[PDB]
Motif scaffolding. Structure first.
Motif, short mmCIF file in Angstrom:
data_model
loop_
_atom_site.label_atom_id
_atom_site.label_comp_id
_atom_site.label_asym_id
_atom_site.label_seq_id
_atom_site.Cartn_x
_atom_site.Cartn_y
_atom_site.Cartn_z
N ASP A 1 0.85 -1.17 0.00
CA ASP A 1 0.00 0.00 0.00
C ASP A 1 0.90 1.23 0.00
OD1 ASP A 1 -2.18 1.63 0.07
OD2 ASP A 1 -2.66 1.26 2.18
N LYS A 2 0.33 2.39 -0.26
CA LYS A 2 1.14 3.59 -0.17
C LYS A 2 1.47 3.90 1.29
CE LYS A 2 -2.52 7.12 -0.18
NZ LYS A 2 -2.81 8.55 -0.52
N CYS A 3 2.58 4.60 1.50
CA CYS A 3 3.09 4.93 2.82
C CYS A 3 3.55 6.38 2.75
CB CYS A 3 4.31 4.04 3.12
SG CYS A 3 4.53 3.47 4.83
N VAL A 4 3.22 7.19 3.76
CA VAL A 4 3.69 8.57 3.78
C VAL A 4 4.90 8.74 4.70
CG1 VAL A 4 3.19 10.95 4.40
CG2 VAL A 4 1.43 9.57 3.32
N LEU A 5 6.01 9.24 4.16
CA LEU A 5 7.16 9.55 4.99
C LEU A 5 7.31 11.06 5.14
CD1 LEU A 5 9.78 10.55 3.11
CD2 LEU A 5 9.82 8.12 2.53
N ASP A 6 7.89 11.46 6.25
CA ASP A 6 8.00 12.87 6.59
C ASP A 6 9.45 13.21 6.89
OD1 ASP A 6 7.72 15.45 7.45
OD2 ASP A 6 6.47 15.00 9.19
N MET A 7 10.09 13.93 5.98
CA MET A 7 11.43 14.44 6.22
C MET A 7 11.28 15.74 7.00
SD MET A 7 13.19 13.52 2.55
CE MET A 7 14.88 13.69 3.11
N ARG A 8 11.28 15.61 8.32
CA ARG A 8 10.85 16.68 9.22
C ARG A 8 11.64 17.97 9.03
NH1 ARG A 8 9.36 12.37 10.61
NH2 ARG A 8 8.31 11.38 12.40
N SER A 9 12.96 17.86 8.98
CA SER A 9 13.82 19.05 8.94
C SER A 9 13.66 19.85 7.65
CB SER A 9 15.28 18.65 9.14
OG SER A 9 15.82 18.10 7.95
N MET A 10 13.12 19.21 6.62
CA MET A 10 12.93 19.86 5.33
C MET A 10 11.47 20.22 5.10
SD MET A 10 15.44 17.50 2.97
CE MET A 10 14.70 18.34 1.57
N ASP A 11 10.63 19.88 6.08
CA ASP A 11 9.19 20.05 5.96
C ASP A 11 8.71 19.52 4.62
OD1 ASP A 11 7.13 20.87 7.71
OD2 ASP A 11 6.66 22.55 6.38
N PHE A 12 9.09 18.28 4.32
CA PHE A 12 8.77 17.62 3.06
C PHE A 12 8.16 16.26 3.38
CE2 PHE A 12 9.86 14.52 -0.21
CZ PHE A 12 9.50 15.13 -1.39
N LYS A 13 6.98 16.00 2.82
CA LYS A 13 6.35 14.69 2.91
C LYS A 13 6.25 14.07 1.52
CE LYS A 13 3.40 15.66 6.94
NZ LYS A 13 3.47 17.13 6.88
N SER A 14 6.30 12.74 1.44
CA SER A 14 6.14 12.09 0.15
C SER A 14 5.49 10.73 0.30
CB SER A 14 7.49 11.98 -0.59
OG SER A 14 8.47 11.36 0.22
N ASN A 15 4.68 10.37 -0.69
CA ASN A 15 4.04 9.07 -0.79
C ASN A 15 4.96 8.10 -1.51
OD1 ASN A 15 1.33 9.79 0.20
ND2 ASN A 15 1.18 11.03 -1.69
N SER A 16 4.93 6.82 -1.13
CA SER A 16 5.55 5.81 -1.96
C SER A 16 4.88 4.45 -1.81
CB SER A 16 7.04 5.68 -1.63
OG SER A 16 7.23 5.10 -0.36
N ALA A 17 5.04 3.61 -2.82
CA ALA A 17 4.69 2.20 -2.68
C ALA A 17 5.83 1.38 -3.28
CB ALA A 17 3.38 1.90 -3.38
N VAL A 18 5.98 0.14 -2.83
CA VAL A 18 7.07 -0.72 -3.28
C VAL A 18 6.52 -1.95 -3.98
CG1 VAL A 18 9.03 -2.08 -2.48
CG2 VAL A 18 8.44 0.05 -1.31
N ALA A 19 7.17 -2.36 -5.07
CA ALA A 19 6.79 -3.58 -5.77
C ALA A 19 8.01 -4.45 -5.99
CB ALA A 19 6.15 -3.27 -7.11
N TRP A 20 7.84 -5.76 -5.87
CA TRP A 20 8.93 -6.68 -6.20
C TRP A 20 8.40 -8.01 -6.70
CZ3 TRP A 20 7.21 -5.70 -1.38
CH2 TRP A 20 6.91 -6.78 -0.55
N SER A 21 9.28 -8.75 -7.38
CA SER A 21 8.91 -10.04 -7.96
C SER A 21 10.17 -10.78 -8.38
CB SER A 21 8.05 -9.82 -9.20
OG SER A 21 7.61 -11.04 -9.75
N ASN A 22 10.13 -12.10 -8.38
CA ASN A 22 11.21 -12.89 -8.97
C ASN A 22 10.86 -13.37 -10.38
OD1 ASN A 22 13.25 -12.98 -6.71
ND2 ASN A 22 11.49 -13.85 -5.64
N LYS A 23 9.75 -12.88 -10.92
CA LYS A 23 9.40 -13.22 -12.30
C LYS A 23 10.51 -12.77 -13.25
CE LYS A 23 5.41 -12.85 -14.07
NZ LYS A 23 4.19 -12.17 -14.60
#
Lengths: 202, 244
Positions: A158-180
């Protein structure tokens, strides 16, 4: 159940408003509460709501309609820290302390406004095994939904929000992986509607 | 604010049909002690409470398999025996002062996982994935990703350590793990996390990044006869160094 909470879940923009509801059929309920549970923690009382009418504490207003036993919680100017599971709980009157009856809870998620979106899918290599990688979809705004994989051999978080506090910057991300054998970041998020301008490095 | 309710252990795995004891340390001067059970990380149910040396109230859910006590100077305890798969839940202790109107203060919970057989228990394998040159060039930021894979049951705590100290800023860890084989009732799990730093911080060969995954597994008393290493409580980590 004895205490019925709604809605089941709620996404709220930062700075936005939320209303939670709690109904009950048991007229022996006299003492109502709102509890909050942050991930990995135990519940913590937010405020009691014992009396008919509004009870304002900062950005939060609890309300009880004693006639119908309707309990509500209204949150103004919602903050990231407000993201949590919210429970209504009730107990009966008794000289002796009673166990609480809980509703099922509402999971409240307060999402950030991404001022400067830069949607992109990057490939990241394992520090010990550069042949192994994951795909990171990142920097998309709140309008993007990350869909779950429709391929049992492809894993997508699912998406996850991280907060780079000192830069007052937030960003969404999601991760995908596979051995296909044919897995590629260019195709990892094919089950999602992603921005047409998403950056896909060569 | 003030003292918190404490609980031991944070996690426990037990074989079906055995005995387990869950321990709670209530706020020192509280008078009422309670146990609750949370199922599937949401539904919360009252079990029992305790006042002046004796059980007071108990729900339909407080089985004959359950017992509670609090010897003087000892922990407030919940004992379950014999355990059954249905006893798998997070158990929360609470304490309060006098009154049906009193705020109940909750502990952090003990996640109890009852298994038909311990052979299914596996610690995680852990990998760290380094920031992309493309992200560095494009955003002047650098995202590391950690993946914890193949663990069972879902008993992990993931943390990030930068130059030997834990960090929280710039971190997001999945709130739920994924099932690696969702069709299987004993599927092992995977969990991801991100740590994002400035490109300037990552582009330094002296900066060290470690993803740590604390696994809560088998107990010394749990029996183990298999060839692979007994899957005990343990930390598994993966690491990356910055690159100039």
């Amino acid at each position: 159940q004895k205490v019925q909470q709604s809605p089941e879940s709620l996404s709220v923009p930062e700075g936005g408003m939320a209303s939670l509801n709690c109904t009950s059929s048991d007229r022996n309920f006299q003492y109502f509460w709102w509890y909050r549970q942050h991930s990995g923690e135990g519940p913590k009382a937010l405020m009691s709501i014992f009396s008919d009418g509004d009870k304002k504490e900062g950005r939060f207003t609890a309300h009880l309609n004693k006639a119908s036993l309707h309990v509500s919680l209204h949150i103004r100017d919602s903050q990231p820290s407000d993201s949590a599971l919210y429970f209504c709980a009730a107990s009966e009157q008794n000289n002796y302390a009673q166990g609480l009856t809980f509703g099922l809870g509402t999971r409240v998620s307060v999402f950030p406004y991404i001022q400067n979106p830069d949607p992109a899918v990057y490939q990241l290599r394992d520090s010990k095994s550069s042949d192994k990688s994951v795909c990171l979809f990142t920097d998309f705004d709140s309008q993007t939904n990350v869909s779950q994989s429709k391929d049992s051999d492809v894993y997508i978080t699912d998406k996850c929000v991280l907060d780079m506090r000192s830069m007052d910057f937030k960003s969404n991300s999601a991760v995908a992986w596979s051995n296909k054998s044919d897995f590629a970041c260019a195709n990892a998020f094919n089950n999602s509607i992603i921005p047409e301008d998403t950056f896909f490095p060569s | 604010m003030g003292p918190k309710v404490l609980q031991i252990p944070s996690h426990q795995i037990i074989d079906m049909g055995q005995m387990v004891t869950l321990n709670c340390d209530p706020v020192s001067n509280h008078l009422y002690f309670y146990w609750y059970k949370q199922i599937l990380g949401q539904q919360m149910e009252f079990l029992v409470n305790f006042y002046n040396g004796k059980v007071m109230e108990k729900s339909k859910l407080f089985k004959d398999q359950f017992s509670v006590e609090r010897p003087d100077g000892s922990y407030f305890t919940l004992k379950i025996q014999p355990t059954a798969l249905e006893d798998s839940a997070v158990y929360f202790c609470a304490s309060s002062f006098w009154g049906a109107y009193a705020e109940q203060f909750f502990g952090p919970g003990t996640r109890l996982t009852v298994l038909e057989d311990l052979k299914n228990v596996f610690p995680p394998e852990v990998a760290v994935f380094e920031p992309s040159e493309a992200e560095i060039s494009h955003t002047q930021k650098a995202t590391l990703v950690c993946l914890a894979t193949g663990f069972y049951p879902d008993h992990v705590e993931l943390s990030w350590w930068v130059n030997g100290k834990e960090v929280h800023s710039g971190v997001c860890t999945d709130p739920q793990p994924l099932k690696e084989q969702p069709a299987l009732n004993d599927s092992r799990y995977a969990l991801s996390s991100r740590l994002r730093v400035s490109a300037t911080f990552w582009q330094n060969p002296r900066n060290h990044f470690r993803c740590q995954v604390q696994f809560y597994g088998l107990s010394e008393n749990d029996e183990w006869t298999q060839d692979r290493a007994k899957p005990v409580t343990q930390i598994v980590s993966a690491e990356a160094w910055g690159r100039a």
